[PDB]
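A reminder before we start the practical. When you read a complex entry, don't treat the lines as separate problems. The point of joint prediction is that each chain is placed relative to the others, so the output describes one connected object in space. Small molecules and nucleic acid strands, if listed, are placed in the same frame. In the example below there are two entries. Take a minute to note the order of the lines before looking further.
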Amino acid sequence: QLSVEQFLNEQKQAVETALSRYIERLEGPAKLKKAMAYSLEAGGKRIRPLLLLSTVRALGKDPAVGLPVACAIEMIHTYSLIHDDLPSMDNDDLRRGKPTNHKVFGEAMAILAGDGLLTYAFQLITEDERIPPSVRLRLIERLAKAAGPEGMVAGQAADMEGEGKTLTLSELEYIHRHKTGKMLQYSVHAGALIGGADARQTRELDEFAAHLGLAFQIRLAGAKEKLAFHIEAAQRHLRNADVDGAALAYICELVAAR
Amino acid sequence: QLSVEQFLNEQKQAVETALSRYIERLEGPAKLKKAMAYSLEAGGKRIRPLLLLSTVRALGKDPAVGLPVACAIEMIHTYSLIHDDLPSMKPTNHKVFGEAMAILAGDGLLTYAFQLITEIDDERIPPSVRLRLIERLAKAAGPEGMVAGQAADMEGEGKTLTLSELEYIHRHKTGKMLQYSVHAGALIGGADARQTRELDEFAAHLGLAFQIRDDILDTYPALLSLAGAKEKLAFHIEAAQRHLRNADVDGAALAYICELVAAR
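Here is the predicted structure of the whole assembly.
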């Protein structure tokens, strides 16, 4: 497929419309809304939202049910990027041809746009129809863990503490897994919970996502092969989960290309 | 009186021990934990946790049960100050850990706060109420609550302020989280819906009184005169007291936190 590229395009659309609706309904300063929207509706491949939605599809449930959670995850990813680009941080000028957030709104407002997105993501998961209460709490819990001081923020702190220092492969596996792996795992995992996957299925999908993460943490002939190995290991795990995972498999193979 | 002081001191102690244990258990980099602990454990008034805990007491329930929530609120308060202190915008995180680590410390605290609430229930608080707590915290803390407050504050420093603009900034930046402390207390304590609304009115007026006194410590007096700021303060103290009575709970601890605003 083909079929799946139609699916991916359709969901990307739904995700962007939804993201735009979430900002527009905010009753708060316009400059804050603009700073949030700027980075949000700047684009990107929406890999994380698409992973969640493909996971829910793979379990036979209407991915629409997951859309608010997929948006929350994309808000979390966008926040992380905004703070990362800051001059005190990775100090980035440009992204995807666009000047970075603080370059347009100043440092203070970019910081707050981040903080607003991070907070708002938690509200999106709560505020909400037919995902059941107990599953909603678990989603929220695992989101905080993936994003928090043992997760993504732990990864970013460890990376920052990298003062022009030849780090160490294990210190770099830590940085990788926590800073980027965790949220890629969470996106799949959240889709598994929403979709109603059993515990074994969930664990196979978690392993799929880690490998996928690793392939991601590579994005030179040797590098190409390690990428290819992880993509294949991911797909092996996807297979072991007895799901309809053609969309997920294709996302996987799209990482493998290039 | 003395029973209340004993109650507030016992709750402050529990909150500080809890906060120190909440940081200690994290399995993450040492510098991030220290930066988080530094601001978080610094040990101030703990107004917000004590408000939650007093509200739970006022409803008859063991305030221990609300301790994770009171800790989550203080973590939100602490992140806001860390981010607030940055030059671009009183232990001063960024001074000691650098700006990057201070930003991340703030980010860690905000996120971790939400975790703290979900994990309750060994041990009581029912799932439906826990979702409402998270929902209302996010709204109080976020881009329509506290973060709105800080942005509106940013969106005109050097611009002179109408009293509308100054009340909005205080309502969102400071008011929402004090209000939420009482509100969450009411939900945790199983308040009747009528009592919850009265406590929310109480907390509203109390938050406003909090900032008006902050000025008079030393503006509201540049917008109202000094007599005017003082009269508005007294009004809010009187309104708060009325609502507290309308409660009607045993809010001697809440009244005592209130009269402390009324003291000076």
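Discuss with your neighbour: The first helix of chain B runs from residue 2 to 24. What might explain this?
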